[PDB]
Symmetry: C3
């Protein structure tokens, strides 16, 4: 089928921790990360980017699910300009999308990143998921304007979905979000490493990845991995099943990353919220 | 079968190089790395952790081979406390174990790590190995109390099995240990990257990895790799076969890691010790 | 069949950027990277290394395609001396070669690196390539004598084939080289991360990797990957097909690397040069 996706380049203040601390973010649609885009393999995506008039910077859009021309299709547009392009989603899986404007390092770091999920045309290529969660890793830099610190990889925090310990009520008592499932259910994690610089060695504490799909593609399946390496600008699908009640903690096992904020708690309870990990609750804000 | 495994959390001085330099380590059973735990797939592991009365810190245990609750099972216990939990080793392969107490970065860095090997229920899933060797990579930090240096990733050395150039008599004249095999033998390396922070690009100089199993799982088999990436908190099984007499040098090919201590020499000779890499000489201490 | 390979350890000045800046380099045959070596699976390689009399340092050779003894075969020879060894290429794919003399970190960093390509015995194992290109990533250091800076991972640029923005004329107008292909053609990238320290997260901007082969081995085939991690001292074979005219940008997606010069542009035009990416044009100099 054909789908219309319109997104705005919005420069606004967003919270980045549990105590309500804000920063001057560059965003898609006024939020970090950007909205989840979900299509089926083979779908035609008609995309539109509107750079808001009140922006002070040129912005662009790069989809990893797209096969196009970088020069003309991914070009930067001025504040008050509108850009359009069309692409088919040829390959199934999970894909990084982000702004590609100069310098990309700053545009990604300030929050211009998201995920596009491409469902396989064969609905039985992947085992049925009972829950779905989007987690995007990024480095937070204290000063959004300091490009030298970004080049020197001097980040302040490594975060999931734009928030320091966003999904960690165990470590941060002021956290208000966490992942939910029942024991026995298959939990599908759509993981993207936005970077711009760092690695992610993703591990579920007190559990194991039942299956891992590099770029989310069914052909690339790997089994019973304790950890998986997701490089900067890469994405993967990871499945998790708990045999018991309690919790797992999804972490970047490079410990200084985890200590700085990269920990997500998933609670396995018999009375789990039926709306959690389903419908439009896949990325928890 | 049911296997009883008991470990003590011991805070003691251990050597970290060949010149006899020591540091105040946190350990399992007073050694770095901790004891090798070996079971068969499907076994019931009854685990017990005793935190020694003379310890000054709380300690815990995290098995990557276990599927449990992080909150209750992997909880910190005080000195003079004893903790028990039971898990089944559901998946075959090679798994990282470590203390999971606060801060996890420091508990690992000070030496609280080890390996649990889970032999496949099907004894013919893996090709017959003639030698077996455990190698665990970790970063050594000059001051075990300086948590800022750990967060900044400012290690002094990258080491195998707790010692600077522990298995390299070629570079270090004070090194007494090395790996042994005969030409044509299949040498199985159980590799764990304990971290806490760094990645490992493992390569056998003058050799090639015959087979590589991500997380040690046979289903994930990879053929004839020159190098394999093991992330922090990850593990893999790697097979090596030399057609000639002489030596190979297993290195972390990120050369600043290798230069700082991450080189292990395997000698291929016809008069190789029949006890080497067998029984319980698999982790050479 | 048997092939003769002779290389000279040459210490001479070479350019490393588009503005013509030079540095005192250590090289094979007087160029960075060294010459492309190409054989077939099963071929016997009779290798010869000559260290030039005007050289100030000892040099050696390490082939990742060779299964030998590190002590005798990969030994360092003094200026004016000659080293000879013979090996078979037992495994097909793409392999890193470099000098392995002390300190190995400096010898690699100063330019003593290249690639040996081993074509599969089964000519059908890989789908037919219409274009072939060699890209070798390395770090450039401002002062080639500063071993401490190399040990601290303090590089100036992350480069492809020795040059800062060598294949990026869109970003840098003084760049005189770029990759060429037609739409629909299969472009095969033989990629090597020489390091000596850094990791690469290779992604084609506005494209996708059709197939990826770890170590270049057909048995390890991966499909439709947006990115692929190549550790230091590792190599991979990556296929790229563009459905349309325009451009793609092959980048190390760790943005600090890409911003420092790790971007290579491939132009997809209907009348692309028929000599490009074929014969001896595979490594553009
Ligand atoms: Cl032991
Ligand atoms: Cl045991
Ligand atoms: Cu932007
Ligand atoms: Cu990207
Ligand atoms: Cu501890
Ligand atoms: Cu762990
Ligand atoms: Cu050299
Ligand atoms: Cu090498």
């Amino acid at each position: 089928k054909t789908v219309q996706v319109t997104l705005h380049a919005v420069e606004t203040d967003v919270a980045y921790d549990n105590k309500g601390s804000t920063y001057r973010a560059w965003t898609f649609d006024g939020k970090v990360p950007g909205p989840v885009v979900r299509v089926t393999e083979g779908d035609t995506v008609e995309f539109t980017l509107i750079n808001d008039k009140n922006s002070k910077n040129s912005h662009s859009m790069d989809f990893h699910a797209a096969r196009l021309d970088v020069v003309e299709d991914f070009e930067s547009i001025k504040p008050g300009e509108t850009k359009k392009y069309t692409f088919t989603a040829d390959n199934p899986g999970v894909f990084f999308y982000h702004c590609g404007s100069d310098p990309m390092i700053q545009h990604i770091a300030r929050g211009m990143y998201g995920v596009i999920i491409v469902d396989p045309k064969d609905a039985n290529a992947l085992p049925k998921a009972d829950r779905e969660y989007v987690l995007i890793q990024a480095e937070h830099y204290e000063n959004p304007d300091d490009k030298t610190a970004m080049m020197q990889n001097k980040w302040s925090n490594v975060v999931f979905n734009g928030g320091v310990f966003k999904y960690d009520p165990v470590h941060d008592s002021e956290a208000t979000s966490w992942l939910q499932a029942k024991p026995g259910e298959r939990v599908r994690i759509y993981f993207v490493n936005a970077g711009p610089n760092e690695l992610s060695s993703l591990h579920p504490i007190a559990g194991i990845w039942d299956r891992v799909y590099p770029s989310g593609n069914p052909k690339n399946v790997q089994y019973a991995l304790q950890s998986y390496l997701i490089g900067a600008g890469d994405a993967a699908t990871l499945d998790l099943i708990s045999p018991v009640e309690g919790a797992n903690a999804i972490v970047d096992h490079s410990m200084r990353h985890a200590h700085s904020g990269a920990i997500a708690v998933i609670m396995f309870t018999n009375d789990a919220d039926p709306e959690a990990g389903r419908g439009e609750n896949i990325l928890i804000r």
